[PDB]
């Protein structure tokens, strides 16, 4: 079902995109904060039942969001959690704190089904956070354009700007930070 998931291990970019879609259903295109408890590793044989539960909104309309996965009778282990915040009227794009990177990933099947393909998103976030550190603390994920194929990443101090080659902004991350995952 997800051939881009390397050896079943799901990059956090795919989870971020899924949270983006869930917020779009809930009218919350912006992720206030996401902390990844554990990555998803799809079994080679069979599948895993993945649930994304968004709790009732509290202050500033922000909705709690959590992810629980279970393989058949598996206990519900939380993979990621956090809160979703409504999109700001004007998002102040953080200044260019990183050199531009034109990230292109081949074979972005169903890239139209997402704002950005999970493989492309993972490559773009590795070009900023770092390959060795899995990005797991994603703050202020604001989505503007959908269906990007080749992205231009302007890294910031902790987040990034994802734009089209034409320069129109597509997405912004306020602070994405990588942690040691083995």
């Amino acid at each position: 079902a997800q051939p881009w998931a390397v050896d079943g291990l799901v990059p956090n970019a795919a989870l971020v995109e899924a949270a983006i879609r869930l917020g779009d259903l809930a009218g919350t295109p912006v992720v206030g904060e996401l902390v990844v408890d554990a990555p998803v590793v799809l079994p080679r044989r069979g599948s895993r039942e993945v649930q994304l539960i968004v709790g009732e909104p509290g202050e500033q309309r922000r909705r709690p969001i959590e992810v629980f996965s279970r393989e058949a009778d598996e206990p519900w282990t939380r993979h990621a959690h956090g809160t979703l915040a409504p999109a700001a009227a004007a998002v102040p794009e953080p200044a260019a704190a990183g050199d531009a990177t034109d990230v292109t990933v081949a074979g972005l099947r169903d890239a139209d089904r997402y704002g950005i393909h999970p493989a492309l998103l993972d490559a773009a976030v590795r070009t900023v956070v770092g390959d060795d550190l899995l990005p797991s603390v994603w703050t202020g994920v604001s989505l503007l354009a959908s269906g990007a194929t080749a992205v231009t990443v302007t890294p910031t101090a902790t987040g990034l700007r994802l734009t089209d080659p034409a320069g129109q902004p597509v997405l912004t991350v306020e602070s994405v930070r990588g942690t040691p995952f083995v």
């Binding site: 649930q51 539960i53 629980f68 279970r70 519900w76």
Partner: protein, 42 residues
Amino acid sequence: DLPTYAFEHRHYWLEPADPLLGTVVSTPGSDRLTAVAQWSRR
């Protein structure tokens, strides 16, 4: 015998796309059970 035309190539393809209780779901960590179904005259 001269070589033939050189055709530019792009990929194209088109893949194909309980009666009453429907789908039964258990809430994670809860005993509450939800049965979701769609019912029509036919």
